[PDB]
Design an enzyme around this catalytic site. Structure first.
Site, PDB file in Angstrom:
ATOM      1  N   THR A  59       0.835  -1.205   0.000  1.00 35.40           N
ATOM      2  CA  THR A  59       0.000   0.000   0.000  1.00 35.40           C
ATOM      3  C   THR A  59       0.867   1.252   0.000  1.00 35.40           C
ATOM      4  O   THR A  59       0.538   2.231  -0.660  1.00 35.40           O
ATOM      5  CB  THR A  59      -0.924   0.065   1.230  1.00 35.40           C
ATOM      6  OG1 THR A  59      -0.175  -0.294   2.400  1.00 35.40           O
ATOM      7  CG2 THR A  59      -2.122  -0.862   1.082  1.00 35.40           C
ATOM      8  N   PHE A  93      -7.699   4.763   5.179  1.00 40.67           N
ATOM      9  CA  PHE A  93      -7.177   3.906   6.266  1.00 40.67           C
ATOM     10  C   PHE A  93      -8.282   3.132   7.018  1.00 40.67           C
ATOM     11  O   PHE A  93      -8.057   2.671   8.146  1.00 40.67           O
ATOM     12  CB  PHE A  93      -6.313   4.729   7.243  1.00 40.67           C
ATOM     13  CG  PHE A  93      -5.030   5.282   6.608  1.00 40.67           C
ATOM     14  CD1 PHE A  93      -3.964   4.438   6.318  1.00 40.67           C
ATOM     15  CD2 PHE A  93      -4.930   6.616   6.272  1.00 40.67           C
ATOM     16  CE1 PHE A  93      -2.804   4.919   5.704  1.00 40.67           C
ATOM     17  CE2 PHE A  93      -3.781   7.116   5.663  1.00 40.67           C
ATOM     18  CZ  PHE A  93      -2.717   6.267   5.348  1.00 40.67           C
ATOM     19  N   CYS A 105      -6.527   1.334  10.116  1.00 38.67           N
ATOM     20  CA  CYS A 105      -5.140   1.001   9.938  1.00 38.67           C
ATOM     21  C   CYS A 105      -4.322   1.356  11.145  1.00 38.67           C
ATOM     22  O   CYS A 105      -4.150   2.539  11.472  1.00 38.67           O
ATOM     23  CB  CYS A 105      -4.567   1.664   8.673  1.00 38.67           C
ATOM     24  SG  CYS A 105      -2.853   1.101   8.239  1.00 38.67           S
TER      25      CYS A 105
HETATM   26  C1  HEM Z   1      -0.689   3.984   2.477  1.00 39.98           C
HETATM   27  C2  HEM Z   1      -0.516   2.925   3.255  1.00 39.98           C
HETATM   28  C3  HEM Z   1      -1.618   2.119   3.844  1.00 39.98           C
HETATM   29  C4  HEM Z   1      -2.965   2.056   3.544  1.00 39.98           C
HETATM   30  C5  HEM Z   1      -3.719   2.766   2.442  1.00 39.98           C
HETATM   31  C6  HEM Z   1      -3.559   1.157   4.493  1.00 39.98           C
HETATM   32  C7  HEM Z   1      -4.939   0.858   4.541  1.00 39.98           C
HETATM   33  C8  HEM Z   1      -5.554   0.067   5.515  1.00 39.98           C
HETATM   34  C9  HEM Z   1      -6.965  -0.189   5.593  1.00 39.98           C
HETATM   35  C10 HEM Z   1      -7.998   0.348   4.619  1.00 39.98           C
HETATM   36  C11 HEM Z   1      -7.176  -1.001   6.664  1.00 39.98           C
HETATM   37  C12 HEM Z   1      -8.524  -1.544   7.103  1.00 39.98           C
HETATM   38  C13 HEM Z   1      -8.798  -2.859   6.382  1.00 39.98           C
HETATM   39  C14 HEM Z   1     -10.164  -3.478   6.652  1.00 39.98           C
HETATM   40  O1  HEM Z   1     -11.088  -2.834   7.211  1.00 39.98           O
HETATM   41  O2  HEM Z   1     -10.384  -4.675   6.275  1.00 39.98           O
HETATM   42  C15 HEM Z   1      -5.894  -1.255   7.248  1.00 39.98           C
HETATM   43  C16 HEM Z   1      -5.681  -2.071   8.334  1.00 39.98           C
HETATM   44  C17 HEM Z   1      -4.409  -2.389   8.791  1.00 39.98           C
HETATM   45  N1  HEM Z   1      -3.219  -1.881   8.352  1.00 39.98           N
HETATM   46 FE1  HEM Z   1      -2.932  -0.629   6.915  1.00 39.98          FE
HETATM   47  N2  HEM Z   1      -2.610   0.707   5.323  1.00 39.98           N
HETATM   48  C18 HEM Z   1      -1.417   1.216   5.006  1.00 39.98           C
HETATM   49  C19 HEM Z   1      -0.180   0.994   5.618  1.00 39.98           C
HETATM   50  C20 HEM Z   1       0.079   0.106   6.665  1.00 39.98           C
HETATM   51  C21 HEM Z   1       1.336  -0.080   7.332  1.00 39.98           C
HETATM   52  C22 HEM Z   1       2.614   0.629   6.992  1.00 39.98           C
HETATM   53  C23 HEM Z   1       1.148  -1.076   8.297  1.00 39.98           C
HETATM   54  C24 HEM Z   1       2.089  -1.614   9.301  1.00 39.98           C
HETATM   55  C25 HEM Z   1       3.291  -1.132   9.600  1.00 39.98           C
HETATM   56  C26 HEM Z   1      -0.251  -1.463   8.215  1.00 39.98           C
HETATM   57  C27 HEM Z   1      -0.888  -2.380   9.025  1.00 39.98           C
HETATM   58  C28 HEM Z   1      -2.272  -2.538   9.074  1.00 39.98           C
HETATM   59  C29 HEM Z   1      -2.876  -3.438  10.077  1.00 39.98           C
HETATM   60  C30 HEM Z   1      -2.139  -4.318  11.069  1.00 39.98           C
HETATM   61  C31 HEM Z   1      -4.209  -3.370   9.889  1.00 39.98           C
HETATM   62  C32 HEM Z   1      -5.254  -4.136  10.688  1.00 39.98           C
HETATM   63  C33 HEM Z   1      -5.612  -3.299  11.924  1.00 39.98           C
HETATM   64  C34 HEM Z   1      -6.673  -3.924  12.804  1.00 39.98           C
HETATM   65  O3  HEM Z   1      -7.734  -4.342  12.291  1.00 39.98           O
HETATM   66  O4  HEM Z   1      -6.499  -4.004  14.051  1.00 39.98           O
HETATM   67  N3  HEM Z   1      -0.856  -0.696   7.252  1.00 39.98           N
HETATM   68  N4  HEM Z   1      -4.913  -0.593   6.533  1.00 39.98           N
END
Ligand code: HEM
Ligand code: HEM
Ligand SMILES: C1CNCN2CNCCNCN(CN1)CNCCNC2
Ligand SMILES: [Cl-]
Ligand SMILES: [Co+2]
Lengths: 447, 454
Positions: free
Chosen positions: B267, B392, B399
């Site tokens: 992402t 996010f 996120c």
């Molecule tokens: C531009 C960069 C990023 C975007 C657009 C993004 C987007 C998202 C989105 C939309 C979700 C929710 C997904 C859902 O509802 O099914 C999410 C969850 C998550 N993201 Fe990201 N993300 C990014 C970068 C990162 C980075 C750098 C990490 C870790 C270092 C990360 C770790 C996670 C984790 C662990 C979740 C699950 C959180 C939970 O449900 O407790 N993401 N992200």
């Protein structure tokens, strides 16, 4: 390592700096000049004022520091007694009343209070619907009518009927005058003040004691704090609250809740008026969520942006702006400032809330969006309700009430700043915007 | 109460063959253009409803009515990401436990500890580009992926993938990318037990074993060494859930490590690539961004405090996430019976999917210039209606890596603008490749060094 200290006045040390209408605001300016910590001396006493999240998180460590009664709290104790807010943690009645009352103040317990909060909110909305074209609203005055009546009805099933009057219920008159005397003693022929003080105490006690004894003799059960107090037993001692302490608690709930919550509503409405982008989002939510003629409990819980507005108002102007602590043992604060057992600290909450290392460079802006993600706020950065076991027992009550009422106000009216009001923050033991007035334009939505 | 539209069907397979395409999210955006803010999508054994308007999505984001659902893609990814944060249900014990333990590792504060290692990788990227000859060009998404993978490896578990030393990736990365690809391809398979796919199944198991073997070894090396680093792994080994005082077990820790690489690298890489693409198409925006980078980044390497001052760069990044949110969908289920928008009754358990790129093109929110790249839209968060901008995700399941992603992307975009002018030497036509995320395929530029030393 050596702590800064503001200007001195010979033998009076720093004391004359608090000889002012607006002492918290004066201390905030001193904190801007001197930084995260400064010593404040007066004849026979010392305290240290803390302003940074760095030092305040250590002060909030309950293993090292406990609640201290400031001089104001010591004077209020002459009529709030050993109620929860003016008791030491080590007094038997603190822990007893805390254990007995905590279940009456939970998020869950608010479901039982909701109907009575709504009763008073409707009265407010009807008052404003009934103004003529020529007229305006005195905002803190009406918010105080509301919060007092709500705590009376939810607290002890008693109607102060503040929306039926210009001169308050004699009880309220005496309470406000007692608070005023307590405050005025802080910087001091006074024989008349003393005689008046005693009469006002007698008024408060006579009313409250009568109610308690009426209720005890009747055996009747209501949805109120008084009922929970009469039925409640502390699991630890196995004892109920005695009738006297019950009366200190009732006086305490009025003093502790009414003014702070009234201030919060007033500041929130002020800031909404100065930030039309924020107002639009708040009002949209209120319209979309509050779909019935009166709000339900579940609907109030869905007012997320309204709650964020309230948290941001508490960030800028926490309406109980300070709390005091003492060192339990010899200890070193921040790796730099050694303290001896018994030394006093005072937390300057408005300054904590302006720590740029926490909140960023735009700390004076009103932006509820800072609270969009509750997880993003570091621990001990936001403390409008104090700390730990001595935090505000009324937090959930205050926020449910303010969220309900602000939601209904936005639903039913547009507000106009017809005087171009300049913020003027009056200091009692709490903070509120003096002389804030608006005009309302009804949206004509029935109740 | 209205009956919702539904796109064309294929008999027994219902709407499923509509996703049998290179570019399914883009196909759904076109369906949303045809059908509006809501449409039903059926496949054998399942139904979802795709939402595209801020009007409906603000209700879907009400946590009292809707919780996170695992899309079919997330269910397939769960075969290798297990009950890591991104593939766990909110009601699983390990969701809340890992969430409580890991939140302090991802705070804005925590980024101060990661900054130095982000800078290590950023410097490698800048040196690579300083070292190209006159004849040569940059493959943008390829180099951004090298950067984001290496950054999460170093900040995540003090492990160097050394992606700037290779053409073929680290075996780990090869397996992970192939597993993700298999997960994705299973989505469009009308006949998933056709013998044709036995080799796919054997390969899938081998790639899982590669990922697990590496990660588990590192965890056990660190546990036996007792050494402490500035990394997520250390925080996971030391961390205790405040409610219970319990730490994560070793297996869940390995799911979390796999999860950080999968969730963050792709992402973030896509975001950098899109941002650079848009800067190249909008010279007035580029000039302001580059001016800010030159004025703020006054030292040979950036400080944490300096990155926080790159305000316009952050707005550029938000605007790129507006037009092309690189994780373009999330899924929800109804907690109880409820009515959406006053018009669409839903039963408990019914699924919704938020089509983020389409939300971000709602003209009732953003105005008539919605396709224009205008970072200035993000100048005042209070002017943006609730739930209009969701790159996010939402609420407690948003996120966890948001601050990490944005710090990294801000730092790196800042350094790129400070050190180089970029030339669109091919007049590149945007072509958006879809995996489980979005990125611009074949985006290439030439750099002209500003000759500013590091
Ligand atoms: C531009 C960069 C990023 C975007 C657009 C993004 C987007 C998202 C989105 C939309 C979700 C929710 C997904 C859902 O509802 O099914 C999410 C969850 C998550 N993201 Fe990201 N993300 C990014 C970068 C990162 C980075 C750098 C990490 C870790 C270092 C990360 C770790 C996670 C984790 C662990 C979740 C699950 C959180 C939970 O449900 O407790 N993401 N992200
Ligand atoms: C916005 C509204 C309110 C604010 C900002 C507020 C703030 C505070 C603060 C800062 C304290 C700690 C004081 C200290 O450390 O010395 C506190 C304690 C307390 N508050 Fe509130 N309060 C509010 C509303 C209420 C309400 C509505 C009630 C009762 C219904 C209430 C009852 C109390 C009590 C009893 C204590 C003492 C608790 C204990 O020590 O056991 N407050 N409040
Ligand atoms: C059983 C009917 N099979 C007829 N054919 C087309 N169906 C496409 C979906 N196939 C999934 N199932 C279930 N389909 C079984 N696959 C059998 C082969 N498909 C043939
Ligand atoms: Cl099959
Ligand atoms: Co078949």
């Amino acid at each position: 390592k050596e702590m800064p200290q503001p200007k001195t006045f010979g033998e009076l040390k720093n004391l004359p700096l608090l000889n002012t209408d607006k002492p918290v605001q004066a201390l905030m300016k001193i904190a801007d000049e001197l930084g995260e910590i400064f010593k404040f001396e007066a004849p026979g006493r010392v305290t240290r004022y803390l302003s940074s999240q760095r030092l305040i998180k250590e002060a909030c460590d309950e293993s090292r520091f406990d609640k201290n009664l400031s001089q104001a709290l010591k004077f209020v104790r002459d009529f709030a007694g050993d109620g929860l807010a003016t008791s030491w943690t080590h007094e038997k009645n603190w822990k007893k009343a805390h254990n007995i009352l905590l279940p009456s103040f939970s998020q869950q317990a608010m479901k039982g209070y909701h109907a009575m909060m709504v009763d008073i909110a409707v009265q407010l909305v009807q008052k404003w619907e009934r103004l003529n074209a020529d007229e305006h609203i005195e905002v803190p005055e009406d918010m105080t009518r509301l919060t007092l009546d709500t705590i009376g009805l939810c607290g002890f099933n008693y109607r102060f009927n503040s929306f039926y009057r210009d001169q308050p219920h004699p009880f309220i008159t005496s309470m406000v005058r007692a608070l005023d005397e307590a405050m005025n003693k802080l910087q001091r022929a006074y024989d008349e003040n003393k005689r008046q003080f005693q009469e006002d105490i007698k008024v408060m006690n006579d009313l409250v004691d009568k109610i308690i004894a009426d209720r005890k003799a009747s055996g009747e059960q209501s949805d109120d704090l008084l009922t929970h107090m009469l039925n409640g037993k502390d699991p630890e001692t196995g004892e109920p609250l005695d009738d006297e302490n019950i009366r200190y608690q009732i006086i305490t709930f009025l003093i502790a809740g009414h003014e702070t919550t009234s201030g919060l509503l007033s500041f929130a409405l002020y800031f909404l008026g100065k930030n039309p982008h924020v107002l639009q989002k708040a009002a949209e939510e209120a319209a979309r969520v509050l779909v019935d003629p009166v709000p339900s409990y579940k609907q109030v819980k869905q007012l997320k942006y309204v709650g964020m507005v309230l948290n941001e108002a508490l960030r800028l102007w926490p309406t109980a702006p300070a709390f005091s602590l003492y060192a339990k043992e010899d200890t070193v604060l921040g790796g730099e400032y050694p303290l001896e057992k018994g030394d006093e600290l005072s937390v300057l909450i408005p300054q904590l809330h302006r720590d740029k290392t926490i909140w960023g460079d735009d700390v004076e802006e009103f932006r509820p969006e800072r609270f969009e993600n509750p997880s993003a706020i570091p621990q001990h950065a936001f403390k409008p309700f104090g700390n730990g076991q001595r935090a505000c027992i009324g937090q959930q009550f205050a926020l449910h009430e303010a969220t309900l009422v602000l939601g209904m106000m936005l639903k039913h009216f547009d507000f106009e700043d017809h005087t171009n009001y300049e913020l003027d923050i009056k200091e009692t033991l709490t903070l509120k915007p003096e002389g804030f007035v608006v005009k309302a334009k009804s949206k004509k939505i029935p109740l």
